[PDB]
Each structure stands twice: as structure tokens, then as C-alpha cells.
Design a protein around this ligand. Structure first.
Ligand SMILES: *Cc1c(COP(=O)(O)O)cnc(C)c1O
Ligand SMILES: *Cc1c(COP(=O)(O)O)cnc(C)c1O
Lengths: 844, 844
């Protein structure tokens, strides 16, 4: 009773009765907005039912705050989760359209950037699919980070246009507006209570993005804050006098908070904005959560129940301000005591860490924060004093040098005059250590504040979670060992197998017996025994090849290069950074090119398997060397791809504007993917898990997610190379004292690049970053030269394996069979049970 | 088969499936947006049918361009014209709401200001109602002119908020975008043809506001341009470097065009913007009109047919640039010759003039225009050369001093070097007259360009249209007498009787026999014979009184003052200006107050009829004296309203933020309205006509619309006072040479105001503007003192008439009976036949 012909009518209805175009206009885009709105009707029904039932039950609700959400296109996945994928397809034929064609008109929401945000997004899919009561909270970015375009100069950055016609996947909630305050000062009022007055005032308005679960009515929510000020803040006097910018100054201030993701902060103005961004996310979100708690509790309202009804999860340090903000409201607005409020805060908040380096943890100038959020600094000050008295107790006086060290490590406010209580212990008068030294900045360490303020701290992979306990927060682990956990990352198998790779999905559900694996992904393990079946292997290679043909279109379309699908599709797809070592990959390609060119055309075929080597991802605009690296790759592509001696034996391609949509086409087509960061530098990595699910083989270092992926799929089905994490610091110091001697094959490439064969750029600057023994930006800090021989050898093993397409496809199948551990579903279960302490809420 | 219960469902549907609020939220406002969207579904159906049928028929289409459209609230009138007024009322009861209550939640669109715009709006109602194919073109103003608030300092100006939640009465047309260019320069290309290159580029996007006719499916359109630039014009480099305003500079430039109506132009930046505004309206609109002509013509496309398919009407001089812009496109883009293009332009364009003073006609600096629109100045230059050669022919050489005068009067470009052809005739070398004199600015006279460029020029009232021929454009009238016309203004009887005054409307349709008068307003004349019937008079006075009670609410609500409905409701409602003479009214009130206070409480009742004297309207922010006048009135209100000796004998009230919605409540309640501008200063006036329709009696000067209103309703049913137009200049010169001696009663008031009785302001400054014999801002230029005795006497006749509520109500009824001439319907018929040459297009 829910058929294709009624859907076609509702699509038509939306084109005409919620129109964005002239009636006689006929576009795939017009069809998209109509089809999006037809699907949306289902999400609204289900959203309202889910919203209402949660209020009735009043179960504990989890809240995931992130500065990023890589939502990607919604259409294909909403239709998928509703299981109207077959009927929407036909409905669109009736109207003279094609689903796939219409779906490719959807713009990627510019609401995230990399893994941090995509994880959050996968987490929202799993939460809904498994019927957990949970929302995401975030900011509604207009222009995103940037849309990447590739010219003959390298990468250029253009602002995103995804909101130009409005977002059909959201609902504005005009009754949901919260005030957020900047600057001002604090005064103690009549009733001993603190009051934060004056300053600047903006309002955050709610923009809801429903999150439909798979094979369930449960539709959770992503609440997005958009900043503005009321029309009356427009200065007409300024406007009429001619000063049109002044007239618009107040609106610009509010609105710019939601303009760009991670705005550049090499300026006091960029730092203030980045800080306004975070407080707005924290303040608006917490005010809303508090509001919902109150409305549900009704007359029987008790704040001790707050952490048994509310869980707040801080994705990275960006939402750290939740801690003091919660303390702010509980005391200043609700009237709770410090200890009463602190206990509620500590039990409500938890922190997830994605960093492996202790000098990559968010720091802020106290002076800047003190000016913008004076009441929060007061609160932080009190928190840091408590923390220090607890260290005093749990340790010393007796042994002071020890205590000195414990206080450095754990302090929230670094380089500040100690509170009078602690300062005592260092009289002799006071030790230089217990005083502000103007030679250095006064700094607020957000990571330490997150640890102190949350009941749980977790890493994102087994090895990393240990690094977190041993290197990063050691003295904290000593103090509160029970805080520290691990929650290995995962990705949703619905977006990243079922819907991005339908051809593989059919093969999977045939041989396993059902399509239940989409939900109960453990059942993929039943593929192990069929790994050597010849027929499975036939279908499995055909799918891979069919998925590769959609990439041929993408490459032709986006770059102009013509490539053959009968080569090996070798992909490296991640953010452009020296530590990720795209440079190691391209230089390995350069070596093989060189070998080919010093070889007979008979031997070229005998020695190397044909490849299409694909690069993708964004460089931080200001990062000069990263931009030179994408430039370098493009130039190699130009030289290699148009070389008669090579032909289809090797192609190199840089796919521009890598995003969720690109990944969705690229990943299912991939046979080899590269995860080759300097060992010890990666915490996890989620693209790794996506590739393996799609039967792509991994070449990588013993680093981040690769380690656990290798366990699950088997070491025989993974190409491992390079120095391990423990060996690094030693190899660097070895370099510093002149003892490192690079392979002859590595000097060959460097010289061959300095040769000019890749155009009118020489690159002596880039190659120069792999030379010397010391210096910032030089001295091959990320061990490209060191790992080179091991790496180019490992790629010879890949070639030899690809020669036996029996072995290759066997390993491909074993990767999909070993992926179950990396479903975000079991990641969420672990979070739900061991941190948030929430249960599923199933509607009847 | 279109019943109240289905409508209630559709209202509900829109609340839930085109939502702007949380689902559990319950507001009159929420009900409004839902009810608006339910009505809108009907407008869409009818809009699309009307749009499609016009394309089929390809009849000549009229296009009304204005910088203003005072649309007012749409809800009550759309529901009215659809005749679902009874069923929407019940549908809203079912949902626990009240139509009137819901309607009062609609914000007034800030798309206009005064009469200019309201006329345009009435014109759109009449065009639809009478089935004429016609659109309005305008700009989509965000903040409007300003929302007026009254404090203890006078008026203050706040930006309007009408778009904060979006406009339910519009449809964005994303496929309708047109490029508009600013600055740049001209170059003659390969093919002798001119090309306008470089400069700045913005895009105007179409926002359609359907205009439903009354008792007809015909739903015409108001196309509104909103300016923007594509996201990519956002400078990320600037944003990340910290310079967030610079990053937003390009967007601000585009968007500010649509920010404020009539932005202040005492700055080169305000003048450039005002000029960008007008060109954008002209360019975008003409590009669209041209596009529609082409798509309809198909293969059989002939540009000679353009003026037989297209009429462009310029409301005032603001759209003057249509003339050269049309010439631009026809030659530069379509390839027509000058004469071929000129003939098409002259036959397509027509001009309506609303000005009575020849020094109130829009002038622009040539230098500013030459910089912004260089190609348009070239075209204007050529037009002005033609014009001058035609004057040469039609006159002189022989008589040069004569020719000198004819060229001054008619020139488009004033104070410019004459073209070589004309310059000859003044050799002796060249006369100073035929040269640019840097002592004065170089000026472009837009009015003269409108006259030259249009086939018809019309005034807006019989007397004014004559002034236009005799004083304003005399030498043009001599040259082309057939151009000059009259089209007396009118107002729609649907918004301004039927829907604003339902209680009167019932009485009208009873005694006339039907409600057909709403359409065929001529049938109101049948009320003359019932003027003296006692029963009609009973119902008629009851309605007036019932309508007055809604004003009591408005006054209480907006000012706090408590007033009795059993007094005379005496209203002056128009823009605050010295020439309109609110000051004359208030000073007359001040005189009566003074008399009351020097009188016994028995006599106070014997001498004066109780009144509620209501003022309303906006002062130009920068106009110091106008603002002091509203301040002065408020202070009188404060003193008078709280005086025990007075009580309900006299109240004075300044209703803040006068707009369409205020008028709709105020007008039907009004018994006396004032139209007292210095004689000869007003061209027409439409509020005058509204009042008379609602049975309000007029006190006014022999000026503008009053003259014709007095003819139609009868001199016995109109309170005339003051000096007539011909006597003015003489009375002013009389003042200049010391010969004017004011009434003793006028010095009494002035002194009594200088007395301080009205608070801690003395007003010696304001009273000082009525004193002296010469000087800007002084010397009683608008004859307040002169007309005073005549005026306060005329008000004594009003009192004596109001005493006999038989006579008063007789005259009231005769005003409604005499109003038929002032229906915008017959105004439109005249425009349709004698200018646009269009016919109605009725769908089957
Ligand atoms: C999965 C995914 C990522 C994360 O990639 P890592 O290699 O884990 O950093 C980034 N971007 C997009 C578009 C993705 O789909
Ligand atoms: C009718 C009307 C006007 C025009 O009034 P005039 O006295 O003709 O200038 C102005 N404003 C509003 C809101 C109106 O309804």
C-alpha cells in the first residue's frame, strides 16, 4: 500500500506546491529538490513520532557535540534506510528521470572536513539504526572549509555554495532560539550570586537535520546552530549616512561564526572567532539540553537526576567549554552549590581524544579567554585550584620536586601565579616555578580541563588508547585510572557497503544467504569458507571491475584524463600533509616510471603490472609545502599520462575536491589503498576500514587502524612495510648526528626529479625538504627516505600478487570477511554501555 | 465540495509538513504561517494557470515598475478574493484559533512607504480583478524604510523584521537569474558593435508574489528582485587572515541594494547606491521582459512587434533608466539600428508623473552616472543630440534667444558642451551658454529624459495634469501635445471597504440589493436616495461606532492612552512634513484646548463637541523640524489627555508606526479626516479617497484629490477652507515685503506654546519657524498663520454639524455614494485603453 505511483505524485506535488523554480522549467536539479522533499515527508512523520515518544519515556539521552559533521548526500541513504529504493527508482522513470542522475545533483553539505566529522556522522547512523536516544549538536556552516579546484598552479580554494538554494534536509525551528554572550564582566549581586552582564549578545537558532535509522522508524536528530542578531541591530543611521558596512557590522559579527569551518587563527581576530564558535556550540547546546530536562521533569524536578538523564560527549577538545559552561548555568542560573554542580558536571561530561602527540592539544591564551569569557575563567580558576589540592593530598609536600612535576603535567592554567594554598609549599621567597613568568605566555590547556571535567576519557584504537595512558595523560591515569578507556572507531556498513556498493552487496547476500548482514555485520565472517570458490571469485572480480568504470567517468569528467579500467586501481585518499606522506607514494611512482623508461617495451610489461594511481584530498591553504606536493603530483600526471612509451601501463591522477560523494564512487572501485603515515603518527583512520569492507587491499605502516585491521583480516592479506613506532625517535636522532645514509635508489629519484623531466618547475625546494640533518621543514623528519627501500620493495610484492588474480581475489574476499569489527554499530554499543549508560528505546 | 473541514486539514498539513517550529509549539504565529500556506496553495494553482494561458495567447502584457509596493498584509484579502472567508473562519475555530487574531500576527511587508507604492499595489489588485495581463516589477527590500517607535524623545527609527522567518507569500525562482553590471567601460569591437566590459557584476534573482483577483481565477504577479553574488565571490584568503569584513565585501555590495528603501543620499556612497538600485530594477526587469517576448515568439520573431506585445510603465522618474537600457540591449545585444531601436523604445515606454513642483524632479550628477553606467551616458548623449536637432527644426536659428530658452527647458544634460551641430548656431567665439561652466554641476535631468523617451506622459489628477502641461513640461507640451494625458488616481474597494470594513459592507449590500458593488462600484450611487432614511442612518452610525471600538484597542495597546468611542474621531494620517501641515492641525487643537481652559465647565460642553484627535505617519529621519513636530504632538497628548478639567472632551493621540495595517483599522472608524496641505502642493492623495468611501467627512484645502472628491460628493458634504493655489506666490511675496499681519488668535497660540505648559521643552525653535519675513526654514513659507483663522473657523462649522447627527450621517452616506469615481478599477480601464492599449484575457 506504499507504491511507486503514489510517490511519483508526491514528487510532482512538491515540484509544484513547494516550488523553487518556474513551473515550465525542467531540470535534474528541480527533480532533486522535489524528490528530496518527497522523501523528507517520511522523515518528518518518523522524526515527530520519535521526538514525542522520547518525551513520554524520559530515558537517558546521549548528546554528541562535534565541530564537524561530514553528513554527505542524504538522498540515496534516506531512501535506502526507508527501503523505498526500488519504488523511488520507478517513480522517477514515470517522470522522465533517473535516480542516480538525480542523486548526483545533490551538493555535499559543507558541514565537516575529515575523519573527526565523518566519524560523528557514522555514529549518528548507528545510533538511529540501533534505536538509541541520541542527538548530534553542531554549527550550520555556510561556506564550509573550502571547495578544492585544481589548476595548472596546484590547488586553489573556493567557498562552498551548498546553501545557495536552501537545504531540503533541514527544518528551521523559530521557537528554539538561545542567547549567547561575549565579553562583558562579572559582578556579585544582591543575593551573593554571580551575574554575567553587558558585553555582546547574539542568538543561536536551531536547524534540525533528521537522521533516519535503517529498517526502523527511529529517526534521531542533528541540531545545528545558525547565528544571527535581530533586525533591530541594523544601524539605519550608519546606513543612510553612507557607511553601509558599519550599518551591517553587528550582523556580520553574529553571522561570521557560522561562515567558515576552522577559520585561520594566525591573527587575534581568527582566535577570537574560533573561540566564539566553540562557546556558541557549547552554550546553545547545553541551554537546549537543560531546557528539555526541565520540560520533561515537570513538577518532580531534581537536579541530582541530571547525569542519570543526560550524557554529553565532547568530540575532541573543541567542545571543552561545556565543562565550565555547565558549572556556570547550574550555579548562576539554577542556584546549585559548587560541589553539587561539580558532581553533576563530572558525571554528565565525557571526553574522546583523537590526538597521539602531546604537543597537538588545544591551547588558548588566558588573556584572550579572560576578555571574552571572564566568568568561565573564574570557574576554570576554581577547578584548577581544586585539582591542585587533590594532587597535594594524593602525593606530597614531603617530596616537592616530585610535586613540582605532577603539578606541571596536570595544571589547567600554565604559567600562572599559584593559588595561595598551593604556593605556600614552595616558600624559601616563592620559587620561580610558583609565579607568572612574562617571558612566556599564560596558557589554558584544554585537554587537561577535559580530563578533570569528564568521568571517562577514551582513545579511538587499542594502540592509541595505550599511548593516551602512557605518554599523553600519564599522571592523570595514575590518579584516576578508571577514567581511561578505549573505543575503537568504526564506519556504517549501510553508507559504506550497501548503498555505495550495491553490486558487491548483492553478491554478499547471495552467498551468506540473506541481507541481514547489513544490520548484523558479524555474519560477513561466513565468507571465509567461500574465499577459494571459483564462482564467487568470478562475480567478485566482475563487480570490482564494474565499480571501476564509474571512476573512469569521474576521472575523465573532473580531470580530462582517459584511463583504462583493466589496470590496478591504486588509491591514496586523505588530507595533504607531510606526515601522511603522499610524497612517499608519488616518489615511489616516480621510481617505477624511471625504471620503465630505462627498459625495453617487452620488459616493461614483464616487470610491472598496469596501474591507475589515484590521489585525492585537501591541503591546508596556508601550508606551503603541502600545496607544492599537490602541484608536484599534477605535474607528474601531465608528464606520465601523455607518454607514448608508457600508454596504459601507468596513469597518475589527482581527483579534485575529495569529499563523501567522491569517496562513495572511488572506494568501491579500489583494489589497493595506501595508509602510509610515519609509524606512530596516526590514532586510527576510518577510510582504512571502508576500503577493507569493499574488498580493497591495504598497503600501510604498522600505525593506527592498520594494526587492528591486520589482526582481523590476517597478516597474509595485508601489505606491511616500514619502521615501527618504537624505532622512530631513534632514527631521527640518528639523522641529527649524521649517521643516516640513504639508499642509492632514493638519491636516484631525487636527482631524477631535480632533472626537470616534470616541466618548468625543478622542485629543488621540495627535494630539499628531504635533505640536511636538522632544521624546521628539512631533514626528512617523517622518514620518507628511510622507509623508501622497504616501501618500493613492498610494492613489488603487490605486483606479484596482482599477477595471480586468484590469490588477489582470495585476499579481497578475506578483507570483507574480516571487517565486521569495524562496524560503527559495535562501536556505539560500547559507548552506550561503558560510558553513556543508555539503553535503546523502541517504539511499538 | 470545497468545505471548511478540508481547509482545516490543509492548515494542519502545512503546520506539520512545511514546518517552521517545533511540533509541540503552539502559537497564533505558527497558525498564521500554516494558514498563509494553505491559502497559498490556491494562489499557486491559479498563478500557474494564468501564467500558462498568457503564454498560449501571447496578448500584449503591461509591466508596472515602481520602487515601492505597499502590499500590506495578504491573508485577509487573498481569502476574500478567493471567497473562502466564511470557511477559513470556521476551519480556524476547529483548530482552536480565531481568524482575526491569526491575521494580526502577519507582519506588514516593508516593500513600500507612501502613496506612490500603495497606488501601485491597488493597481495590481484592479489589474487582476479585471483580467488584464500585467505584472508589477520591484525590489525585495529586507529592512524597508524603517519601523517607527515613539519614545519620550519623539520618533526613533528601527530596521524592519518582516523577513526574519521568511515570507510565505512568495516563491523563489532559481532558474530566473539575470546579470547586472556596474562601472566598467565601453569598447568598439571587431564588428563595429559596442561592447560594455569589465566593472562589477551581480545577479538579480526573481521572487514572485502572486496577486489574486476578486471573484476570478486570474492571478497576476509581482516579480521582486533580490540581489546577491555567487558563493565563490567570498574571499577565503581574507577570511582566514582575520579580515572577515573584507571576505564579505562583495556580498555586502550586492546585498545592500535590497537592504533599505530610499537610502540616504547626502553622500557620494548613498547616491551611487540609490542609482544601483534603480538600474538593477530596470535592467533585471527589462532582461526578463525581453526573454519572455523571445520565448513566446519562437521562430516567428520580429522586433517591430515588440511594442505591440509589451508596455512598460515608469512610476515616477525612479525607473527612467529603462529608456537607455532598452536602447542598450536592442542595439548592443540584438543588433538593431538606432532608429529601429528608438522607435520600439518610444512606443514601449510611458511615464507617470506625481510631482507638482518643477524643482522636485530627479537630477543626477553626470560624473557619477558616467562612472557607473558609461554606456548609458553615451546613449543619453545621442538622445539629447537628437532632441536638440528636433528643437532646431521645429523653431529657430532665426530667433536664437527664443531657441536658447527652448533648449534650456528641454535639455536632458544641463551645463554640458553642446554637440557640434547645435553649438554652431551660437558662434560670435562660442556663447558662454553653449559651454560647460565649472561654476555649476553637470546634471542629468531624468524627467525630461522620461518625456522624450515615452509615448505618453500623465498626471494623477485633473488639476495636476494641467499643471504638468502648463508649468512643468510646457515646451514639451507645445512640441508633442498628444503625449500628455490625465489618469486620476483611485483605490481598490475590496481592501478599502469590503475587507477593512465588513460591518459597513453588509449595510451597503442590503440597501443597494446586492454585493455586486464590490466589483461594479458605480452601483454605490443608489445610496443617494436613502441618505435621509432614518433606519439606514441608525445602522450606519452603529457601524461607525463599532469600527471605532477597534481603534480604542489600538490606542490603548500602542500608546497606553484610554479614550472614549463616543467622541468625534478626527484623524490626520500622512507623512510628517511642514508642507502637509500637521503643525496647522495641532496648533488648532492647541487653540481649542486654550479656549476650554479659559471657560466654565458648563460652557466647555456648550462650545465644543468631544473629540479624539489622531495623528499618524513617519518623519524623514534627517528632517530635524519634522521630528520636532511629532515630539511636539506627543507632548500635547501627555498634557491634554491627563488634564482633569478636560476629561473625555478632548484627547490627542499619536499612533506609532503608521502602515497599511494601521490604516485598515483607523480609516473605517474615522468621522473626520484632514487633508490640509498648502494649496497647490499636493498632486492627488489616495487616503482621501479611502476615507470618503468609509463615510468619513473631509476637512481640507482646494488641493489635489480634494478638488475632484468635492465635485463628486458635493460641496455641501465637504469642509473647505484656506487660500487657493493661485493666491499662494502672492501671499509669500506679500510676507517677504513686510505686509502680512497675523491674526491675534494666532499670536495667542504661539505665545501659549512658548509658555511651557506642554512640559520642559519650550519650542521657541518650532514657533520661530513661523516668524520673520525671509530665510530658509523660517517665515512661515507654508502659510500656517495665514490659513489659521479660516481653518479654526471651518472647524467650528464641523462641530455645529456633528451636533446634528442627522445631518452628519446624511453627509457620511453621501460621501460613500459619491466615491465610485475613485475606484482604481476605472483608473486601470483608462490606463489599459488610452496608454497600454491592452485587453483583458479571460480563461475559460
Ligand atoms: C572516511 C572519510 C575520511 C576519513 O579518512 P581518514 O583516512 O580516516 O582520515 C575523510 N573524508 C571523507 C570524505 C571520508 O569519507
Ligand atoms: C493610502 C495610504 C497612503 C497614501 O496616503 P496619502 O494621504 O494619499 O499620501 C500612505 N500610507 C498608507 C499605509 C496607506 O494605506
Amino acid at each position: 500500500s506504499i507504491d511507486s505511483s503514489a510517490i511519483a505524485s508526491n514528487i510532482q506535488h512538491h515540484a509544484d506546491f513547494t516550488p523553487l523554480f518556474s513551473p515550465e522549467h525542467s531540470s535534474p536539479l528541480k527533480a532533486y529538490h522535489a524528490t528530496a522533499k518527497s522523501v523528507f515527508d517520511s522523515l518528518i512523520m518518523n522524526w515527530n513520532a520519535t521526538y514525542d515518544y522520547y518525551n513520554k519515556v524520559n530515558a537517558k539521552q546521549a548528546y554528541y557535540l562535534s565541530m564537524e559533521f561530514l553528513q554527505g548526500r542524504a538522498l540515496t541513504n534516506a531512501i535506502g534506510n526507508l527501503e523505498l529504493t526500488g519504488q523511488y527508482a520507478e517513480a522517477l522513470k514515470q517522470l522522465g528521470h533517473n535516480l542516480e542522475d538525480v542523486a548526483s545533483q545533490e551538493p555535499d553539505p559543507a558541514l565537516g572536513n575529515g575523519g573527526l566529522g565523518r566519524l560523528a556522522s557514522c555514529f549518528l547512523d548507528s545510533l538511529a539504526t540501533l534505536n538509541y536516544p541520541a542527538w548530534g549538536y553542531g554549527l550550520r556552516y555556510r561556506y564550509g572549509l573550502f571547495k578544492q579546484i585544481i589548476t595548472k598552479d596546484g590547488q586553489e580554494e573556493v567557498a562552498e555554495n551548498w546553501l545557495e538554494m536552501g537545504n531540503p534536509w533541514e527544518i528551521v525551528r523559530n521557537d528554539v532560539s538561545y542567547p549567547v554572550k561575549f565579553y562583558g564582566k562579572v559582578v556579585e549581586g544582591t543575593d551573593g550570586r554571580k551575574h554575567w552582564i553587558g558585553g555582546e549578545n547574539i542568538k543561536a537558532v536551531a536547524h534540525d537535520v533528521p537522521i533516519p535509522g535503517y529498517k526502523t522508524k527511529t529517526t534521531n536528530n542533528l541540531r545545528l546552530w545558525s547565528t544571527t542578531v535581530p533586525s533591530q541591530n541594523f544601524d539605519l543611521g550608519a546606513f543612510n549616512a553612507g557607511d553601509h558596512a558599519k550599518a551591517n557590522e553587528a550582523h556580520l559579527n553574529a553571522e561570521k561564526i557560522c561562515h567558515v569551518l576552522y577559520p585561520g587563527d594566525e591573527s587575534s581576530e581568527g582566535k577570537i572567532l574560533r573561540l566564539k564558535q566553540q562557546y556558541t556550540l557549547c552554550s546553545a547546546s547545553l541551554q537546549d539540553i537543560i531546557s528539555r530536562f526541565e520540560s520533561r521533569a515537570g513538577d518532580s524536578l531534581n537536579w541530582e537526576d541530571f547525569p542519570s538523564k543526560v550524557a554529553v560527549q565532547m568530540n575532541d577538545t573543541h567542545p571543552t567549554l561545556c565543562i565550565p559552561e555547565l558549572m556556570r548555568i547550574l550555579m548562576d542560573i539554577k542556584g546549585l552549590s559548587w560541589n553539587e554542580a561539580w558532581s553533576i558536571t563530572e558525571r554528565t561530561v565525557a571526553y574522546t581524544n583523537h590526538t597521539v602527540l602531546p604537543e597537538a592539544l588545544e591551547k588558548w591564551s588566558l588573556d584572550i579567554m579572560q576578555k571574552l569569557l571572564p566568568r568561565h575563567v573564574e570557574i576554570i580558576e576554581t577547578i584548577d585550584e581544586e585539582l591542585m589540592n587533590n594532587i597535594v593530598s594524593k602525593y606530597g609536600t614531603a617530596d616537592i620536586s616530585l610535586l613540582k612535576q605532577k603539578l606541571k603535567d596536570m595544571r589547567i592554567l600554565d604559567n600562572v601565579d599559584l593559588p595561595a594554598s598551593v604556593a605556600k609549599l614552595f616558600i624559601k621567597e616563592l620559587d620561580p616555578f610558583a609565579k607568572y613568568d612574562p617571558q612566556f605566555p599564560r596558557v589554558v590547556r584544554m585537554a587537561n580541563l577535559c580530563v578533570v571535567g569528564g568521568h571517562s576519557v577514551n582513545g579511538v584504537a587499542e594502540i592509541h588508547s595505550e599511548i593516551v595512558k602512557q605518554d599523553v595523560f600519564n599522571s592523570f591515569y595514575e590518579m584516576w585510572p578508571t577514567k581511561f578507556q578505549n573505543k575503537t572507531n568504526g564506519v556504517t556498513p549501510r553508507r559504506w557497503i550497501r548503498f555505495c556498493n550495491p553490486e558487491l552487496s548483492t553478491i554478499i547476500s547471495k552467498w551468506i544467504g540473506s541481507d541481514d548482514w547489513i544490520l548484523n555485520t558479524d555474519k560477513l565472517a561466513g565468507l571465509k569458507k567461500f574465499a577459494d570458490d571459483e564462482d564467487l571469485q568470478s562475480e567478485w572480480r566482475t563487480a570490482k571491475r564494474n565499480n571501476k568504470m564509474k571512476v573512469v567517468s569521474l576521472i575523465r569528467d573532473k580531470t580530462g584524463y582517459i584511463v583504462s579500467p583493466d589496470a590496478m586501481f591504486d588509491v591514496q585518499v586523505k588530507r595533504i600533509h607531510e606526515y601522511k606522506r603522499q610524497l612517499l607514494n608519488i616518489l615511489g611512482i616516480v621510481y617505477r616510471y624511471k625504471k620503465m623508461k630505462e627498459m625495453s617495451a617487452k620488459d616493461r610489461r614483464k616487470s610491472f603490472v598496469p596501474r591507475v594511481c589515484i590521489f585525492g584530498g585537501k591541503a591546508f591553504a596556508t601550508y606551503v609545502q603541502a600545496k607544492r606536493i599537490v602541484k608536484f603530483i599534477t605535474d607528474v600526471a601531465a608528464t606520465v599520462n601523455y607518454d607514448p612509451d608508457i600508454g596504459d601501463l601507468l596513469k597518475v591522477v589527482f581527483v579534485p575536491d575529495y569529499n563523501v560523494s567522491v569517496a562513495e564512487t572511488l572506494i568501491p572501485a579500489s583494489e589497493l589503498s595506501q595508509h602510509i603515515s610515519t609509524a606512530g603518527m596516526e590514532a586510527s583512520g576510518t577510510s582504512n576500514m571502508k576500503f577493507a569492507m569493499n574488498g580493497c587491499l591495504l598497503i600501510g605502516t604498522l600505525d593506527g587502524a592498520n594494526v587492528e585491521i591486520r589482526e582481523e583480516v590476517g597478516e597474509e592479506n595485508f601489505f606491511l612495510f616500514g619502521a615501527h613506532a618504537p624505532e622512530i625517535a631513534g632514527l631521527r636522532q640518528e639523522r641529527a648526528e649524521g649517521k643516516f645514509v640513504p639508499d642509492l635508489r632514493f638519491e636516484e629519484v631525487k636527482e631524477y626529479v631535480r632533472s626537470g623531466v616534470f616541466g618548468t618547475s625543478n622542485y629543488d625546494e621540495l627535494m630539499g625538504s628531504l635533505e640536511g640533518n636538522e632544521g624546521y621543514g628539512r631533514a626528512d623528519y617523517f622518514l620518507v627516505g628511510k622507509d623508501f627501500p622497504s616501501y618500493i620493495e613492498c610494492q613489488e610484492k603487490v605486483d606479484e600478487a596482482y599477477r595471480d588474480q586468484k590469490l588477489w581475489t582470495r585476499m579481497s574476499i578475506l578483507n570483507t570477511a574480516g571487517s565486521p569489527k569495524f562496524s560503527s554499530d559495535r562501536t556505539i554499543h560500547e559507548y552506550a554501555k561503558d560510558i553513556w549508560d543508555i539503553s535503546p528505546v523502541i517504539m511499538p
